[PDB]
Amino acid sequence: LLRMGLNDNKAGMEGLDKEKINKIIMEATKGSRFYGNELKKEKQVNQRIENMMQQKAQITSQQLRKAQLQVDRFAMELEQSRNLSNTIVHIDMDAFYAAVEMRDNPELKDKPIAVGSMSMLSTSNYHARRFGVRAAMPGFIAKRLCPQLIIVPPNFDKYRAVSKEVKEILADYDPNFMAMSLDEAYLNITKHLEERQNWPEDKRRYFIKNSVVFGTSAQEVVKEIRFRIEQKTTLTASAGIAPNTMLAKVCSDKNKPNGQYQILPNRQAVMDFIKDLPIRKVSGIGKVTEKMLKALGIITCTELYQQRALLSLLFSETSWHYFLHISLGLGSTHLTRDGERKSMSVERTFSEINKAEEQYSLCQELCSELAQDLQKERLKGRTVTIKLKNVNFEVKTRASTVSSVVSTAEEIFAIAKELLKTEIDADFPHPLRLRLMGVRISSFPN
Amino acid sequence: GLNDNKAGMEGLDKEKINKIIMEATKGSRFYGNELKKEKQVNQRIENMMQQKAQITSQQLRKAQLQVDRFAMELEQSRNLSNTIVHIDMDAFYAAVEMRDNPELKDKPIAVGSMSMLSTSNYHARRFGVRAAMPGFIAKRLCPQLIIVPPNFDKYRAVSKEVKEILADYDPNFMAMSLDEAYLNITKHLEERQNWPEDKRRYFIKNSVVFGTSAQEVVKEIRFRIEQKTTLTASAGIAPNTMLAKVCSDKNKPNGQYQILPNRQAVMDFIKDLPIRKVSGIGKVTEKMLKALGIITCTELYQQRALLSLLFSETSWHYFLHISLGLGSTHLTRDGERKSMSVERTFSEINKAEEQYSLCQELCSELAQDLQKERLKGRTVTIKLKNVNFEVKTRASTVSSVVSTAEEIFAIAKELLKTEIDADFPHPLRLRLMGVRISSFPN
DNA sequence: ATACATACC
DNA sequence: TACTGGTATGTAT
DNA sequence: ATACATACC
DNA sequence: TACTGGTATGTAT
Ligand SMILES: Nc1ncnc2c1ncn2[C@H]1C[C@H](O)[C@@H](COP(=O)(O)NP(=O)(O)OP(=O)(O)O)O1
Ligand SMILES: Nc1ncnc2c1ncn2[C@H]1C[C@H](O)[C@@H](COP(=O)(O)NP(=O)(O)OP(=O)(O)O)O1
Ligand SMILES: [Cl-]
Ligand SMILES: [Cl-]
Ligand SMILES: [Cl-]
Ligand SMILES: [Cl-]
Ligand SMILES: [Cl-]
Ligand SMILES: [Cl-]
Ligand SMILES: [Cl-]
Ligand SMILES: [Cl-]
Ligand SMILES: [Cl-]
Ligand SMILES: [K+]
Ligand SMILES: [K+]
Ligand SMILES: [K+]
Ligand SMILES: [K+]
Ligand SMILES: [Mg+2]
Ligand SMILES: [Mg+2]
Ligand SMILES: [Mg+2]
Ligand SMILES: [Mg+2]
């Protein structure tokens, strides 16, 4: 089914008829170049699954036994270090962009809406999700699913502004909170909770926009956070409260929209939560990882744990280590400060460009935008990468690393232009037929 | 209603079109503000007509002599020695999109969004669809209309390809926008008289050879543009820029027109020319002059004395140049810019903290634009449009120049603060904000 | 170091 | 008519 | 120097 | 559902 076939792994999308919805998507997508490319990618994934299953058939009882012991040794060390003492909160705005648009055009409140264009949606409101409409779906497809759908263009500066208002509230509870995008954040409220236990009602009191008082527990802190967000912005958030970031993230989606959920911070509660948790609900387990694990009979975190020996023989160390943490209900119990960025990039999609001189011009423009962006943070990098996507949706990237760092439109373009030239020359006399180009700079000195 | 002063919009059922536009527009906030602006123009027309009725024979006679004196100097210096070309791409953005998606060449299309179109192709223009009209209205006029989102970087790239051709014929050509330019081909015509066929042969992408006349040069330019970019241009040839621009529109699209450089050809062209065809005569000026019985450049000349009493010096000087078929005969290099701005429309913002943040973001973009050209300025102006489409601008000027996001924002935020305080306790209900910097050291 | 894929919002 | 854009990282070479 | 209006693409 | 954005300059205070 790939990308196109409805992805219901999002809040507010339970109980839909994927057979009926996918017939509509397929009718709207039939014969397109996008579809052609999706079939190619699906066949790739299936080959990868086949290679894993062939490797699996070679595994013997002896090997599995040995892996089992080595994995259980590592699990014992993870288990002994389990930290249940931090209160991690994940805050996540409800239908963020759509909610802002509905707030400011209340005629939209009772309608199914989405934000974006006929080419692409960035989100949808909860009414629209009941028709299968969602982020990453083209608007023209969404309209087939929901003829009455209102598609609203984005107002990115508004969303940055709302986000600033939210973050100012969040800073009160964890001044080192980790903002992930505009609409979500992790907080460690451990310290705050400790101080809060001796705060008089005056420091936990808010007037409505007659006053209200919030208690001293974690659930009360998060009710206070949500209340302040709603009062300041007129928008709701959901929240998860858990002993680590992995669990808190799963929890914040659970009672969406306008809800919250806490896993009590005792081991038994964690394990009972994780027990029948579908792995697709955990951050980092995407469509492909899900498909590969499903081939092994793995759908839930219990199954993930049960097959840990096998996973240690079929997946890299970074992957089976990650799976084992999930399967034990472990994750980060402290938040790290936003580090040095490793890359910066710009890319753009367009109607077909096939003339070499126009491709060079496009490349130069992208190099200039990217130089402007680097200038803002005074960064310089040693590696320039171009990205080309042809009209059949096939992506290539072509990188070059240089001895001395670069920053200016001129320097970036002198590298990118050569990378592009090499591609134009390779297909000659056939023009490159492009729908997207991008330029990325990386290898900043650390 | 339908502003039909464009190529391809001749002989439309404007009755039907204006009904559809009007059903789509009446009752809106937009329409409310249009009525207010139309009333202000009508008031301005009424003030003028009441002034006109007080003008004496003696006043008219004194004006007439001053204007005739000024017209003598203008006529004396009439310069017919330069061949000025105006090049203008046909349906520019739409043509680019049709070029690169074959399914579109036989359909009505427009470029932009459901909120706003930047242009339309000639098929769509037959339904009254055009630039400056919202796509949602265009779709009522033309259900089958294809609205293509813009690809601005492609248009810039095509413009570069076009400008490279134009530099062969006049290296000091003046680019006016992405799709249009003025060239002075006088020098090139001198050189070209003695050029062998080798220097005037271009192959189709079979050879083609072009002659030595101005018309043949412009054919050669238009042929080259179509071979390089796959798009057509129209062109106007004339002794000055004012006339050249009129001519480029005359046989649009994919056409060409010349006014030969003799006084008589200029006057026969100008004679029954509707004034609205001249660049700088917009809707408002046209309506005011129509109120005086002025539709053509002939009528504009005749009422020159009256024009000098009813209009500022700048305006009647300008009208007089037009009525004599005069204009620029040498093209200046693009001088120092006078300002830089950014503005943006959004769904309603009414919370003061959000308004400050938008102002901040706008100030950063603007500092970024300035940093690119290393410019600093002393005047910062904010622009606020409310949900009833009313525009306010508020400026402040400082001693020493500024350029950083912080400096620009320090000034802008106090201007915004003043507007928020003046309406308190009612919030400002905005649909647009902008920031502009000006007063560069020149 | 480079190419391509996966994942997230 | 029309299938996004920015950053990090995993996998494989 | 400031505010608002017109014009162009 | 939905009426643009950038620059210059004219009109009036
Ligand atoms: N594929 C995508 N492409 C572009 N923008 C996207 C996107 N996915 C999301 N965004 C933008 C638009 C989103 O509004 C915003 C936050 O992402 P979420 O928190 O994942 N989604 P939301 O808040 O809408 O709904 P809820 O949390 O209740 O499920 O990021
Ligand atoms: N009101 C507007 N708003 C935004 N962009 C606009 C615009 N009007 C035009 N443009 C953009 C899009 C336009 O394509 C481009 C050139 O403007 P023209 O030469 O005045 N119009 P075209 O070339 O389309 O048609 P033809 O010359 O055959 O009459 O500028
Ligand atoms: Cl889809
Ligand atoms: Cl098919
Ligand atoms: Cl739409
Ligand atoms: Cl915005
Ligand atoms: Cl390619
Ligand atoms: Cl209109
Ligand atoms: Cl559309
Ligand atoms: Cl360019
Ligand atoms: Cl230009
Ligand atoms: K191709
Ligand atoms: K208002
Ligand atoms: K206002
Ligand atoms: K498509
Ligand atoms: Mg969200
Ligand atoms: Mg989120
Ligand atoms: Mg044009
Ligand atoms: Mg033009």
Short mmCIF file of C-alpha atoms and ligand atoms in Angstrom, two decimals, chain B residues 156 159 163 174-180, ligand 11:
data_model
loop_
_atom_site.label_atom_id
_atom_site.label_comp_id
_atom_site.label_asym_id
_atom_site.label_seq_id
_atom_site.Cartn_x
_atom_site.Cartn_y
_atom_site.Cartn_z
CA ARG B 156 13.34 34.48 -13.15
CA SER B 159 13.83 36.22 -17.84
CA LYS B 163 17.81 39.38 -21.15
CA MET B 174 16.51 48.76 -19.31
CA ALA B 175 14.76 45.83 -17.62
CA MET B 176 11.43 46.95 -16.12
CA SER B 177 10.23 43.65 -14.67
CA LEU B 178 10.82 39.96 -15.46
CA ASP B 179 8.76 40.04 -18.65
CA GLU B 180 9.53 43.43 -20.20
CL CL G 11 13.81 42.45 -13.69
#
